[model samples]
Target: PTAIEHMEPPFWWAGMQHKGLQLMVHGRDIGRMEAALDYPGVRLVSPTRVPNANYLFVDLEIGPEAQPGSFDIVFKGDGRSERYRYRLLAREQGSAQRQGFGPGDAIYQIMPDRFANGDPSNDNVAGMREQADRRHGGGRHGGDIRGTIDHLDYIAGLGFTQLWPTPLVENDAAAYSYHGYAATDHYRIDPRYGSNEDFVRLSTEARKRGMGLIQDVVLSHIGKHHWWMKDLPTPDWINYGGKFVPTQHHRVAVQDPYAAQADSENFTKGWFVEGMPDLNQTNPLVANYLIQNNIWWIEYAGLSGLRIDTYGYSDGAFLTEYTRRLMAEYPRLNMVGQEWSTRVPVVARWQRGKANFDGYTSHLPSLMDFPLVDAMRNALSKTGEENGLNEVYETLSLDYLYPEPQNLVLFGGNHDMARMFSAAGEDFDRWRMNLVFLMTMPRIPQFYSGDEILMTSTVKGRDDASYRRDFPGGWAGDKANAFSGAGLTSQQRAAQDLVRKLANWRKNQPVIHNGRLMHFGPEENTWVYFRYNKDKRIMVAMNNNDKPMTLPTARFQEMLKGAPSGVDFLSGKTVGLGRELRLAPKSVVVIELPGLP
Candidate 1:
């Protein structure tokens, strides 16, 4: 008999709700042995073997009495015996009860490979498949956890309460691995980015600054170079034996009553791309493995929440179970899935508490608001004659479809989309409107890196490389430094100041977070809304028309019954509740009712 070569989940914690642990042991002729464990409060259930003689699945039951310690698994067969050491660690303090990011928080999303390069020494790590190439748009540029740690002050100063860096796990592919989506090793952090310890440090440091870290998790697929691809634990470990079969991307089919089984299978089982292998979560072993990996990361790193990538692409039943288990472990923690659909029903179906036709239940608390995103883009990019503002108003009216609309994540642009400035036609007025609307809206706001300073990208189409550009002063010898407010244009400075002021002000505004929203229908290229509660009232008005217009104040008398005057938060000018309110052309006014003046 050969000795065990690998044991997945190398270690586990003792006081877990999951009493039953499935350990995957790999070795030549390892399945030919009978496993036995000698430890208090731990008992061996059964050793199951598959068609592959090199792998064994050992089940164990850890009782509540099990203490944090190490134990040895002895395998005896063919008159030979071998021992493998396993460890059980203690969970962190109040780890399972950690709170997650929500409406009260502003998330700042960063692509670590392009955010900053704090340590130049790890730029070209030895044995890494791709070297650091600053000139290439798609190549790795040496940004790591150290870079993010060094810029915490900059991020916190913007009044963001949550930091969501893209996947920091290992993506040991031959090319285009900087994004960290195609994970090769789920348990290890990419050395080029940093080690597992560095990830822990990032979480710890971010928490010190009142910023919670949301881990980006890719559950749908893995890199082609994943170690499991080399050896077969089971023939059906991956979909189509790891062959390249692209997905149909018919996202709505999952919710369609007329959808055929084959179409749904093809959509979920097909590979995301040539370099990524689709996982077969239908397999019981694969399902258990993926679930345990997610729990392990959450427990180990003390993560605040999870941002699931390509959430709808996974098996629907498996995702439900995955989310259920996570919520069971961390009841207060949040998990937001990416549906990437512009239809309200499609996006709303995945969120928790949605009354569905098929009785399909989801434990997922939130989803990225793609419908609002599309509406916002249409509202800001097109002219008033095209009814641009009407799109936004109509989309907001669809909030009745969601159980907890405030839990949804709202953003101007993300890594997968074009920059907001480019989408706004490089118009600072439109950009400002988008920023103000995003902050004042009743949703968890998220800002992509460099959006505060009006970063622009190639506006033609979806250019991932262009959108994920590095910060101005992230690297050495950068003439224009966004960090220090040096060498910036007047437009850039004004835009940054606008975001800084609005975001900081929003940080303390409980009305915007929990108050009810009442909006008027778009009238002649203008729209108005009020976010108010018992203690405060904020009225926002936007005029998208090219020429100045006078807004009739009598139309809003019901909401302004007690307030005689209002102060413009943006301009600091007080206006009496007179017959008419004058608004500048293409301007946004955020007024606080009952002005002190």
Candidate 2:
């Protein structure tokens, strides 16, 4: 920590998908120095510096012949000299071919600080601004990597194929660091959470248990206290010249057919908050820095996939270039970007496949189906209403807007919204139907943690500490143990049991994974849908009526043809597919059959 205080991407693998590397060096007036290196196959490009005399950037072309070893990067200035040790670690076998989570995988999302506390030792670490304060609603609650590692079985056993804990990267804010979105250091894991090695170990251990770890990444902003805040690489390193400017939060201006140029820039260039400085992605160096950082994390942690936060809040061109390089490296990998808009047109444009109106070519693989979620959540809590089942049915009909509709991540609730139970009006029946729809839908389903046990909340959007609550049995002295069900109420126990059965059931169904969905009408408070392929058909019939009734087969004869009888998935009873199907009040019946003849 003497001559050069830091070198971002302090080390790198010799054979990365992208061979070129730019190392950002930080120190006292290091921009005045010249750097050179003597390594067999590594060629050092001339170091570049900007207005910030304390920062220097050195690029290196890591050729195929480069060997993995430590080398001294010699920096000589007008009157001073420094020797920085750098290393190139070798890549792991098959690292380039790591498969990301896809349609078959169910992602369980958790906010680490609110999940569980496995080790109280790292609760309050030194050299950080915020201390652990569990009593404070918005304060850090002492959850860390140790806690997550301790309970990997809880998630894996719940039939989740992917785990997405909110970003564990450093968020050195004075308060509200629990969210971990406003990153302070991209390379280093927040010490309070654990070291960078612990993060790698988390993914390694998770992979061993049949679950791929998905990292939560924020591209929109960084904490004001980030190292770059002190001495930016250039004058335009931060949006609006490193000053606070309110964003218009205009979703329409982003893809509006007739949006003003000023409005578009205001929406993208504005800050998320006073504390989170928006990174100027339009700047080449800034874009390179963010892109390189993303590649480093995927490689360093051996991540299965990445969930991009604030997907629509950055420069459109930067997003195109950013995802292009990532997809180039890991072609099979799945990255889902989150755009919080509830409109299909706005969300659909960012999806990978498109012949957009304004010639906007999007390259990312999948986007979160916020429009579907909004429609479902609004419909789940009501019966005999216009914005009820019909709204959901019509939303599904709009799937034509998406190029690959099945790739979209669909969820009943997320950390940004009220828990599923709360959204369902705290009614177990309604919640079950919502969960059923989530599992049976054509899109990839992601479940927010704590929903299995009927967690509730009143908050929505950015300030959602209530929804992001600590698990009941995650800590030492908790009265209720979600893992063991020691203190849970009967209803909570039933809810957990239901989620486990459905999730495990969904995981093994190939028909549910890649099948085509054909939904029917909501006649007289009852609706039905079928998920089918050439080999099989799975039918889901939901009745919102208070009275039990029979669904006549004439309406669904198109699907019922040549299908003799179907086995009820939940009850395991064989029901005749010929004439009539029984439907209970506020209940759903999931049945499976052999393919149509």
Candidate 3:
């Protein structure tokens, strides 16, 4: 390798909101070399030499008249000179104006390592410390990018408009990297999954079927095996002096008015785990690097949305500035952050336009809706007389805290928690009730993969490896093929079928998309809610009684507006709304009220 071995941004466009570019050039004592470039409309600001000699930060400003072309970055040193050819590709048409995932979109989140194994050859890739081992809970399961590509129809067939696979970047750890949380390399895709081109291909194919690709981002930490650990650019690059001091997980302290300084510092600066080192975003260079890294991915992948993991764990100033820059670049794109806190105020302050008392402003437009998740988990686990629908009813009442409630991403379960089926205690009807509520809610719906087929996960005390279960039929010789509907239980089939119908139905229902909500719940063990816009209405009625019951419809007259009848979208049955509506025990129904006066 030459003196200048690697240059990042690797490439960039001319006409961008960000005129400044920083290239993290790495090689043998590259930081000691003086740098110069002679592009027509580009000027070299300076070559920043970090404490480490192997890394160099080359700052450049691309002028307004800069054309998309190649340029030689000249690096001259004590004994050698290097000419590295860098490129500036033209921006894709309307790349900045791409719309983000919103209320109209349903997100389907899949664990890339456990989804499918389309290419067996790359299962045990060279240089990877951990290879395919389906038997182990934390090892890779042979699911590659091609596996997802081959099953695009199965995903689109279920009526999901967005696909969110857990971080696909390289996690070259000795073990337990399958979940893709601890990233080893930011720019490279894991070979076990596919190349960067394969990810772009996934994006294109998903777009072909009316689905947008959402890349999950983890800016809080990186794997211990990350190359930076071997030859770090600075002592402060990794927080806590690169030591593995576990985080206090004091999520409330950051917003707590009287929180001690150590509480906030321990929460943010501490390591996520022993194998993952925390990043010090307070360092300007580090902040710029992470921000530019995010921008590069957004531009390179043509992403529709970004899902940020552990958003609150990073330094608030850096994250705020990061979101500001990202939003400035793509004004219309939607980005959601995962705070995982169940309290409304803790979450509310992070959304954009919030008048925070602490003067903390954020550009986050959406959240994972953990407060709602907490309520739904408590509400949907009961049956018969003590059917717990009151918790869900109470949770919605607190939506006043959020500036934009509909922007929250609602889901019954996710990769980091128990499956919806397991949470429902394997009650098929209860699970169905959960789905019905998820689909009918005002917030954007998100479905965890394998939850449709009633996938159950059993986790140990602190081991989350069991959380991400493999989808049936992803591997070559799986017995139960959920994709083909072969060797599946009737309950599984019903679950899958119900998701398909409900998701597809909600996809085109404007009433559910942008409608005002009305609710009258826990009436004789039955909960009822309506999503109504200007002219349309969707009624979601759940009866959790031990037996069939009939409830008089007179109370709903205020919102029903003299509508005489409606058809059940699920079963396509016409029901008379004259006096009373009959409901089956342990059942939920989606009624479409059309032509409302």
Candidate 4:
């Protein structure tokens, strides 16, 4: 007498050899099944029905008559009289599977309130749950979708290929929650951010400029101040309703079989801080709503990629089911999870094509590389020895655990962390060295907004707000401006211009984006590498010594052998292929053979 649960079938749902679909349905004791697909040449080849359980594996064969179009597979219950559920899946016959964007692409993340101000009227919005006040840091600061539309030229001129704006959904909370992680209504966009129509316009215009849009989504929780907080959907809809439970911050426990039972529970069930209440995805209504929300965003926004926040905190089964349904709808789209786990195998298990011990699979294609970020920070820190870059080289040796190592999102820092410049203690030589290595690394790289100009924050406050400081001149009365180049200190101007030159130059170098990486590190203090393909080769060297040191050319014989010679891209100077090349203290070289004398 209970309503049946429907697990929507996937896109490209047809069975293939060595890669068949596996499904399990659960409810009361009684189990039943049914499916039908009528076409000219396609027929049901093998459909196995499991006895006394809700498990079923349906397999079909495609003949010559099938074409590229949508097809329906219906399921019926025990007596073959009542229709239980049905799923619609599409089949693309000859079309190319859309490959995910790679290192060649650049993603620009913009903080909505701090980026630009298009409409000031929305600043003091009426009848909203959260009253607008510009004085409070958490209150809305009037950056709207129209402002982004106005600056499309500037964004494109920087040669960025992708845009990753934070969540734009409705968040009517009372206080400092401007960062849009907590949702009030999954269906509505915050009027402060803009309307649903504005999102579509943002996507459309971005695509016209040869850029893709990636949406930052949070499925873990909703705001306590939401409209639904007053009305009851169900008692079990939210986790630990009316009770607060702080997390143990133990991410490693999830994968360690030797971990204590309490540690495992703490990792998965604990609240990600007290402000955000975790959602109970095991609730059928909650699960269906979340699934439908994903489909709605994909269809409405024409999104090319997804950045899932707090990926492992939700129910494991629900996460798998959500991905199964999404992949069925948009087979070519890319979804990257934020695992923040340093272990490569742990992150790899959640990506597509990895076989888990529990026989579960995740359809996610990518993840952010916290390991690389940590290594890069350590490599350039003042406390670290000259051999700091070895940390990154050693960590990369363990990348075989990943299904696709190249797809990882490599970065020096993000909005959540202190800017790399601040972390490096305002040392320009170390900053430039780190940037050179990051721009030449062999993975998709993402740079935070202020990183280009060596942005720094208050040293006292140790939270994210300090890192997410206001960008200079984003507002009307600000004296120091990054956009207009006004009132900047001499040091600030030099750093800003250096960033512009390197970024613009990197945008045009295909070798840096797609070439193979070969590196050598004999001493921790000195390192060298090359990004090489058939037609071109670029060599880079770094020495962290406080005094000038000579880079032994004999050490690079494997890469530089029989080559004519090279010149530094940053400074147009030709160099000899001798026994050793002189390198100044904390210096780096961006070398290429095409520009040599």
Each prediction's whole-model lDDT (CA)? 0.87, 0.87, 0.86, 0.69
lDDT of 3: 0.86
| TM-score on alpha carbons, each prediction | 0.96, 0.97, 0.97, 0.80
Angstrom error of the Cα, residue 233, model 1: value is 1.8
Could you tell me the TM-score of candidate 1?
A: 0.96
Candidate 2: 10-residue stretch with minimal lDDT: 378-387
Candidate 4: stretches off by over 4 Å: 1-100, 133-135, 357-360, 384-386, 458-462, 522-524, 594-597
- Residue pairs in collision within model 1: none
Clashing pairs in 2: none
Candidate 1 error regions (>4 Å) = 1-5, 78-81, 384-386, 594-597
Better of 2 and 4 by TM-score: 2
lDDT of 2: 0.87
Q: Is candidate 1 or candidate 2 better by TM-score?
A: 2
Per-residue alpha-carbon lDDT of candidate 4 for residues 362-449, written as tens digits (9 for 90 to 100): 8787889888777767777735464777887888777777777777888767777888788767888888887787678877777677
Ten contiguous residues minimizing lDDT sum, candidate 4: 12-21
User: Residues 162-207, candidate 2, lDDT per residue (tens digit)?
Assistant: 9999899999888888889999998889988889999999999998
lDDT of 1 by residue, 1-597 (tens): 237877877889888887988988888888887898899989898566798878888999999899999998898889998888889999887878999998889999999988888899988778878877898988998899998999999999989999999999998877898999999899999998889999999999999999999999998899999878888689898999877899989888889999988888888898989898999999989888888899989888889999999988899999989998999989999988999899988999998888899999999999999999899888877774646788889999999999989999999789998888988889887787888899999999999988888888887666888898888888888888888888889999888888789889999999889987888888886888888888777898888877887878888876776466678888788865578778788788898764222
**Cα lDDT for residue 107, candidate 2:** 94
Number of clashes in model 4? 5
